[model samples]
Structure formats: structure tokens, C-alpha cells
Target: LGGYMLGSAMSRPIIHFGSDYEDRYYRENMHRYPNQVYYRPMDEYNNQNNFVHDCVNITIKQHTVTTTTKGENFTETDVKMMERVVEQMCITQYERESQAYYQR
Candidate 1:
């Protein structure tokens, strides 16, 4: 039952937790954001028995922002704003669960 509940929550749409304006804002501007690579672990690991070497190379590069687009410009402020929006969205759910568990 716990697993089922977790699956439901994970699969649920963000629109359920956010307002229509927020949803529209996200959908409209999501593509404008860059494909940022925050973490790239190039560490290697090998299994003794199999002698298999595994490594990861994460490439972070700048993307071109094409012209002929009219909307909120992609800036540091926009990135932080979106980050706060998502953080606030999750915090609401987090606090709800925390309070519920505390009550019980």
C-alpha cells in the first residue's frame, strides 16, 4: 500500500499542485532554458570478477538562443525564479505530509 501511494504521488501531474497560470508559465518558458549539466561524475569503477570498467563523461556546453522569440528573457533571475517556484511547490507537499505524520 505504501508503495502504491508513492507511485501515485510520483506519477501525479505538476498541474495538480500548481495553478493554471504557473502551469502555463512553465510550459511556455521551459524550452527557453538551457540543457545545463549540474553534476558529471567521471569516476571509474571495476568489478573484480568481471573485469568490467565503467565510467561516465558528462559534457556541459553552452546552447545558442535563437532570435525570433518573444517572451521572458532567459536570465539568472528567471532560473532562480523557476527554482523557487519548484521549491515552493514541493515544500507544500512536504509540509502536508510532515504535519499529517506528526498528528498521528
Candidate 2:
């Protein structure tokens, strides 16, 4: 039970992610947008014991992330930077649950 509990995200009390488009282009051609979800189950549970680790959900959202001139760009380092940013949020959540385990 000392592994990362990534599955806590599976039962996130409320919605934790979404794509909203205020851009006129996306709004007008909303039908073209592909909001997708695909899940793959594991044949063997050999990795960390969590649903998020053993399974996968590849969500594809088209016409995503609308912004006024301040759009977020995937610059060389910034792209990886966002990857790290995503991990830390879940890391923080994992710590919360682990703390209880530690106290016990």
C-alpha cells in the first residue's frame, strides 16, 4: 500500500477537467470538435496498484483551450514544464491520502 494512489483521481468528488471554447471559430464549427474518451484495461497488474496506473483513458478534445492573445503555448521547455505541473497536482493529492496512512 506504499505506492502512488493515482486512482483517487478516478473518483474525483466532482469534475476536475474540461474544455471550453469561447473562440468564434470553435463555437461556429462545434460539430467538428472531437470530444473523445477511450479506456484500455490491463491484462496483468504488474505496475503500481491503482486504476490510473493499470488502466488508461485517452481523452481527445478538439478546438481546445480558447484564450484571448494570452494563449498558452507549448514552447520547447514549457511543454515539459506543463507535464511536470500536471504531476505535482496529483502528487499533492497523493500526499494527502498517504498522510492518513502514515498517521495510522
Candidate 3:
């Protein structure tokens, strides 16, 4: 399946129709791991950039930033740094969504 994901959301949402290859992958493997994911950044799968824009769009919809570097100076911000944010919050949030940015 050439389908991709943005964060836990699909970059290409699976519908009932698509290409033969896409369909095959969907019918057999895709559903096997409804939450299975191939990270875009590692390039072993879809290009990370494929979903970067989409993730940004989704974040906007959810009022969440895809990645943020905004509160570095705020001691009261509860780790506003991007790495900290992801580690303390992002990873968990994505995991809760079932199909995150990085996964098997």
C-alpha cells in the first residue's frame, strides 16, 4: 500500500476505491494492522514531507502545532520546547490516536 499518514491520521485516507496495488495492500495488510504505520521521515516508507504539510493542516484544525519551539523562555510552560513537548506530550498524544508519525 502506498497510502501514507500524517501524525496518527492517514495522509491518504483509505476509502473503498483506489488503485489495484493500493487495494490489494488495503484488503490484506492494511486492515491487519489498522494502526500499523510506516514513518515518513525514515524514508523506508512515504517521504516525511508527504505528511508534514498535512500534519500542519491537522494541527491547525485541532489548534495544535505540528511541532513547536514557542515557549522556550517560559518556566511555567511545562516544557514548551519542541523535543520536550513531543517527549512529554506529543508521543503520548499520537499514541492515543493509534497511528502516530513514527511506528512500525
Candidate 4:
């Protein structure tokens, strides 16, 4: 059930939350927004097993990040960065959810 909720979000490109005019506009004119804009949900989001891996390789030649679900071995710095991003994204998702309800 939880996955179904978040998975529904992947259907849209951008999610909006709150009482901003932009959010209100998108809610009123979904057709104008096309596939780019989406409103928020009605309830709190379920965020289980939401952590993501953040391992990167950097050098004078190149830089790259390797992602993995098995994130047990990343350095403290990389892990912290990944956690911050996840939390930020989740907050945005919830804000969008709130905007969705505000419109309705």
C-alpha cells in the first residue's frame, strides 16, 4: 500500500505543496500544466527502507557516483550526504501532498 502511494508520484514530473499561487494555479488548470506538475497527497507519507547509497570516485581524470541498495560500507561523509538528500526529497514530497489536498 505504501509503495503504491509513492509509486503514484513517479507518474508526474514535478510535485507541488502548500498555499503558493503557483500551487493553486496548477491545481486549477491541470491541463495547462500537462505532465509536468502534480499536487500533494492527503495524508502523511510512508517512508520505509528509503535510504540510498552514495559512493563516489573522484580524481584528476574523472568523477562518478556508484549507487547501491547494499549501502553498508560507504564512508561517513557519503552516507551523510545521501541521507540529507533523501530527507529533503521526502519533505518536498509531503509538501506536494499537502498542496494536492489544499486544492481539492
**Considering TM-score, which of the candidate structures 3 and 4 is the better prediction for this target?**
4
Ranking by TM-score: 4, 1, 2, 3
Tens-digit per-residue lDDT, 1-104, candidate 1: 11111100321124422467766666566554422221212134222211111100111112213322444454654555444443443444444444665799
Candidate 2, residue 88: the lDDT equals 40
Span of ten consecutive residues with least summed lDDT in model 1: 52-61
On TM-score, who's better, 1 or 2? 1
Clashing pairs in 3: 8-99
Off by over 4 Å in 4: 1-73
Q: For model 2, what is the alpha-carbon lDDT of residue 75?
A: 47
Q: Which has the greatest TM-score?
A: 4
* lDDT against the true structure, each candidate: 0.34, 0.32, 0.34, 0.34
Could you tell me the lDDT of residue 93 within candidate 4? 56
User: Per-residue CA lDDT of candidate 3, range 1-104, in tens?
Assistant: 14433445332333333356644544354321223232234445333343434333333323233224443222322222222222323234344443643454
List candidate 2 stretches off by more than 4 Å: 1-71, 101-104
Model 4, residue pairs in steric clash: 16-96, 17-95, 40-96, 40-97, 40-100, 41-97
TM-score of structure candidate 4 = 0.35
| Preferred candidate (lDDT higher): 2 or 4 | 4
Report how far residue 103 has shifted in candidate 1, in Å: 3.0
The lDDT of model 4 is 0.34
lDDT of 4 by residue, 1-104 (tens): 12222213333233344445644444454331122112223246333223111111111001113233334334554343333333444545555655775799
